[PDB]
Give the backbone structure.
Amino acid sequence: MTRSAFANLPLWKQQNLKKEKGLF
Protein backbone atom coordinates (compact mmCIF):
# COMPACT_ATOMS: atom_id res chain seq x y z
CA MET A 1 0.00 0.00 0.00
CA THR A 2 1.72 3.16 -1.28
CA ARG A 3 1.89 6.56 0.38
CA SER A 4 -0.05 9.66 -0.43
CA ALA A 5 1.94 12.73 0.50
CA PHE A 6 3.38 15.96 -0.86
CA ALA A 7 6.92 14.57 -0.69
CA ASN A 8 5.66 11.58 -2.70
CA LEU A 9 4.67 13.87 -5.52
CA PRO A 10 7.12 14.58 -8.34
CA LEU A 11 9.09 17.78 -8.26
CA TRP A 12 7.17 19.49 -11.01
CA LYS A 13 3.98 19.10 -8.95
CA GLN A 14 5.69 20.72 -6.02
CA GLN A 15 6.72 23.66 -8.21
CA ASN A 16 2.97 24.22 -8.73
CA LEU A 17 2.20 24.06 -5.07
CA LYS A 18 3.04 27.16 -3.12
CA LYS A 19 2.46 25.80 0.32
CA GLU A 20 3.26 27.21 3.74
CA LYS A 21 6.60 25.51 3.73
CA GLY A 22 6.79 25.39 0.01
CA LEU A 23 9.53 27.88 -0.56
CA PHE A 24 11.37 27.93 -3.82
Remarks:
- The longest helix spans residues 11-14.
- The chain has one helix and no strands.
- The radius of gyration is 9 Å.
